[PDB]
Ligand binder design. Structure first.
Ligand SMILES: c1cc(Nc2ncnn3cc(-c4cn[nH]c4)cc23)ccn1
Ligand SMILES: [Mg+2]
Ligand SMILES: [Mg+2]
Lengths: 289, 295
């Protein structure tokens, strides 16, 4: 429950600073709570035709399901009314260190240490488990939607695709979400996010998802046809290969649940957990340029 | 003005709107002439891609049906920061043809308006096609009107696709509704085979958009529409009110197999496009709309 009629103007409450990206629909600004100076991420979306119900939906999911440490917390919603085509500001917790895509991009050799991948993946999985118990599928798990705070906390964003008129990036999409001759009605199940989580792990390991060198339309054709993607390097632990294999089961019917993957030795057994939190924290401060 | 450029925009153009893929109203420094400027954050590797794509650019003159592409500029930022790519084009004050059908009762345009607009799109396309260029994104949002009811095609360097190869939005599939069956990869088309006739399918979808306010399959999830476009027979107009000539035009554009689709020149001779007796009155009817909405 949320009505656009009750929603106040953001003037004096929140102000925009600089653009830090975009979502499914609308630009994402680094915002500031006027009275305290506290940073907040502001999603500014134009309320138009069809988008009126699409943006309204994101508000209800963000409001009700962001009450977990691994999901960026919903603060509030506002409408900066323009002549009778308005602008909606969706305010949530700011994640200072940026996306995990940005992390691997700003790392020597565009790869992260295996124990960093283990920590990040578990945090994605924990946020996913919370959504899945609440009968919610994220539907857009990718490094761009996995953000870090200044204190190396991992948080999930964007309920823009969650269960518009544009098809986004295909590389993190599970085979079953792509419609083809033997799969006409797609078939989104919660396990679709686990495939996406595995592709995000290859992204942390190699700096890019598998098939990144393909035209997006060609990758969309290949994902359901190709065998499960594999890590290029042999350096990785047997536990990491097994985790990737676990996430990337082609047929979602034999793919493990979020709960099963949370018990995977790669996720479950993390002895250097405290040190990687320090290492990661140190790395985000090191990126001072 | 050089079209094989990458120079800094200082002294040539400037943003006469808020600083910050969004498009801002700009102007030529020396003349004060209005322009449309697209601004994108580009990486160091992305600027190299731009250099190569500038080498791939085809040459073509100004045309009354193409909002003139002026060039590519780079606005610098400190060393190690994301510079911004500038793509400059002729300004079209009255907005898109989608805006035109949205600001019309019952979200439909008069058949003679559809005939005039389609012919203008076709004329701009013929100019690009004769110069070995595919527009690749013919849709109502990319067909603009000037203050004087002139129809112009959006061009931010269509011969190299500079606004579609850089930025985060470059790896996205995009909206599927105006896509021709051959541009969508499927079982019998494992490779997206783009051709000049792909714009002609888009032209038929833009005509249904002018007629119904939305493209066919608009009610479908974009992923489902992408699966249906190559599988479904050619889309058709819902209403039976339309002239036989209009149905034939739609049918002409929307030939499923592009190998069997007519050329821009053939479609320019179609009775729906060729025979326009109320052309003068339509140019007045459209000019009247621009003025009525200018308040
Ligand atoms: C909702 C939120 C969203 N983005 C962000 N949400 C929250 N915090 N945040 C920090 C950065 C960021 C920091 N540095 N660079 C980008 C970007 C964001 C995207 C889509 N939907
Ligand atoms: Mg809960
Ligand atoms: Mg939370």
């Amino acid at each position: 429950d949320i009505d656009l009629s009750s929603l106040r103007d953001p003037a004096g409450i929140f102000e925009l600073v600089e653009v830090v990206g975009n979502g499914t629909y609308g630009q994402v600004y680094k915002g500031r709570h006027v009275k305290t100076g506290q940073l907040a991420a502001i999603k500014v979306m134009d309320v138009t035709e069809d988008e009126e119900e699409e943006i309204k939906l994101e508000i209800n999911m963000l409001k009700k399901y962001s009450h977990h440490r691994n999901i960026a917390t919903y603060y509030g919603a506002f409408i900066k009314k323009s002549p009778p085509d308005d602008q909606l500001w969706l305010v949530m917790e700011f994640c200072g260190a940026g996306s995990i895509t940005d992390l691997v991009k700003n790392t020597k050799g565009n790869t992260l240490k295996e124990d960093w991948i283990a920590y990040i993946s578990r945090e994605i999985l924990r946020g996913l488990a919370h959504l899945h118990i609440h009968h919610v599928i994220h539907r857009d798990i990718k490094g761009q939607n996995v953000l870090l705070t200044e204190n190396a906390e991992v948080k999930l964003v964007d309920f823009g695709v969650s269960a518009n008129t544009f098809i986004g990036t295909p590389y993190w999409m599970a085979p079953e979400v792509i419609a083809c001759d033997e799969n006409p009605d797609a078939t989104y199940d919660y396990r679709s996010d686990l495939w996406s989580c595995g592709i995000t792990a290859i992204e942390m390991a190699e700096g890019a998802p598998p098939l990144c060198d393909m035209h997006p339309m060609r990758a969309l054709f290949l994902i359901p046809r190709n065998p499960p993607p594999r890590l290029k390097s042999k350096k990785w632990s047997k536990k990491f290969f097994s985790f990737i294999e676990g996430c990337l089961v082609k047929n979602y019917m034999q793919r493990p649940s979020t709960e099963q993957l949370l018990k995977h030795p790669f996720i479950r057994d993390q002895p250097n957990e405290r040190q990687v939190r320090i290492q990661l924290k140190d790395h985000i401060d090191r990126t001072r340029k």
